[PDB]
Design a protein around this ligand. Sequence first.
Ligand code: PLP
Ligand code: PLP
Lengths: 305, 305
Amino acid sequence: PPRYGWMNGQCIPWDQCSLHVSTQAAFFGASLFEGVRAYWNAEREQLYVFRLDEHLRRLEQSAKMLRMKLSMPIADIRQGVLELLRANEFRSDVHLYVASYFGINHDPDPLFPTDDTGVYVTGTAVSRLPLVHTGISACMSSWRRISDDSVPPRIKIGANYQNSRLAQTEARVNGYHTSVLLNSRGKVSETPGACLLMVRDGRVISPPVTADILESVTRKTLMSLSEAELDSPVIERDMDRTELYIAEEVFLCGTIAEILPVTTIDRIQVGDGEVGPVTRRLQELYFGVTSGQLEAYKSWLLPVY
Amino acid sequence: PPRYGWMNGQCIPWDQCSLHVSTQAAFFGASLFEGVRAYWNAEREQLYVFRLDEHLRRLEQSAKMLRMKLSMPIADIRQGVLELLRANEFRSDVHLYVASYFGINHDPDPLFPTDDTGVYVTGTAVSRLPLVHTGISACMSSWRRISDDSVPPRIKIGANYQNSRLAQTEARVNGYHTSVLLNSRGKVSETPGACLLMVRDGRVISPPVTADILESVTRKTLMSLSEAELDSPVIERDMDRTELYIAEEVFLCGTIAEILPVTTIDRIQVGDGEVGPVTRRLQELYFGVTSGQLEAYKSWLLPVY
Ligand SMILES: *Cc1c(COP(=O)(O)O)cnc(C)c1O
Ligand SMILES: *Cc1c(COP(=O)(O)O)cnc(C)c1O
C-alpha cells in the first residue's frame, strides 16, 4: 500500500484517510471523482501526469449539476496532485483518484446537498495488464445502462457505479472480462468501466455522447489522435449490438483501462479474432503520447519532478 | 449528537464511526441499509422498535442479489440494535440506520464485490415533524425514476439515492416539500424518500411493486391496517399523474416520513385541500400501533428496556 494520501490540503498517513459514516460521501457515495494516470518514463527518470487539465475541467463542470461548491479552487487541487505524487516518491505508473465529496449534513432533509464539502487525492502504483497485448472477451449485459434523465452517466460520481457493478459482476460470474450494456433505446452505450469503439469499412466508430456514456478523456484523446495521425476522423453514431459481430475490430478505452482490444463478444470472434491493426496503431500512438515519447503532444503531460 | 454508534459487534464513540475512503462502502455508497424507527411511550416509560424483523428480512434478501455475505447473522444484528439503543440511553423517538457494507477490495477489478464485509448501526433522537398534521406540497419531477433492469429501486443501497437526491433537490429549489417521479412507462412510482398512495371513489390505491418503487415496510403495514381495520383492501394498480389532481386524498409513507398528507400537487389542491378522513384514520391507526397503544398489534413491537 502507499504511505500517504491527501485530504483537504495536506498529505496524511494512508491509515487515516477516512470519512464518518454519516457523511453524504460515505453513505450515498456522493463523491464526484476523476481517475487520472501518471506514466513513468525510465529513460529520463520522469513521471508525467496525463491530461490533468481535462480531468479538472470535467470535475468542476460536473460539480455544477450537483450544486456542489468546490472546497478549494481547481488550481489548488492541481497542487494537491503534485504534493501527493511527490510525498509517495512514486517511480512507476500510478493510478490516482481525485475527489470532491459532500460531508456532514447541514439540513434536516438527508436527500438535499450540503455546503460542507472537501477534496481528497489517492494514488497507488499500478502496472500494465498483459490483457492490453492479448485482447479480452466481452459479453452483452442483461442489465440496461442508466439514463441521462434518471441518473446521468455523464457525471462521474461514486453512486453511479451500481449499474456498472451489476453488469461487471455478471460478466465475471459468466467467465468474461467485461460486458457491453445496451441503453434504453436498445443501442450500444459502453462497458462498466470503459468506452467502446469499433472499426467497420475502414472507419473508427463510437457511440455519441447521447448514448448514455461518460464523455471519456481517453475517448476524446483517441479521437484527436485518429484524426491528426491516421487522417481518420472517428464517426460518432448510434451502434447496434449485432454490428459488433461483423466489425473488423473492437476495443475499449478509459484511464484505468488504457486501450483494451476485444477479440470475442459472446464467444463470437471479432473479425479474425486477433488484435486488429487500427487498435495496435492507436495503442502505439497512445502509449507513445502518455509516456512522453512524442514531442508533438508534450503539452498534454505534466512533469512531476 | 449521540454518544455512541455500533460497528462490527461493539458500541464505539460516535466520533470514530468511520470508513476508509478506499472501501467500496465509502467510495461507491455500497452499503445495503434499513431505516428503522423506535417509538417512545411516556405512559409506561418504554421504547418500542417497530417491525425490526421485517427490516432484517429485507436486508438479508437484498444482500443475495448483491452477492454480499453478511458479516454476522441477522440475529446478532438484532442484538446490535438493542445494544445501541441502550448504550445511548434514548428516552425519545429514534431513527436508526442498520447497514451491511462492502469493505476493502480483495480483487484487482474495482467493480467486483469483495468478501470483506461489515455491519454498523447508527441512531439519533428525532421528533415528529408538524408537517404530519399540516400536510405538504408536492410537484411532479422532471427526473424519471431509475428502472428495475438498470439500478433496482427495490434494493435499499446508499448508491441508489442519486435518483432521489436529484428529484428532491429540484423540489426544494422550486419551493415544494417533495416531488413525485414518473417511471420509464410514464406511470407514478414514488417520492424521493416515501411511497405514495391516493384515495379515489372511496378506495385506497397504490402503485404495484413493479412501478419502480421500494417495497416499503410502512406501505405493507398500512395495507394490513386498511384491510384489517377499515375493511378496505388497498388496490395495487398503475396510477397516472393526472389522477392525483382528481383524487379525494393523497399521502406518503415510509419509516422516516411516517404518514405525510399531500394537500397540493403542482399547486393544485388535492380534493378540497384539507387533510382527508382516510389519511387521518390511517394516521390514528399507525400512531396507535407504533407507540404501543393497540394490543392487537403488539407483536410488531420490540420493547428495548
Ligand atoms: C471514468 C469512466 C470511463 C473512462 O473515462 P476517462 O475520462 O477516459 O477516464 C468510461 N466509462 C465509465 C462508466 C467511467 O466511469
Ligand atoms: C426506505 C425508502 C422508503 C420507505 O420504506 P420503509 O421500508 O417504510 O422504510 C420509500 N422509498 C424509498 C426510495 C426508500 O429508500
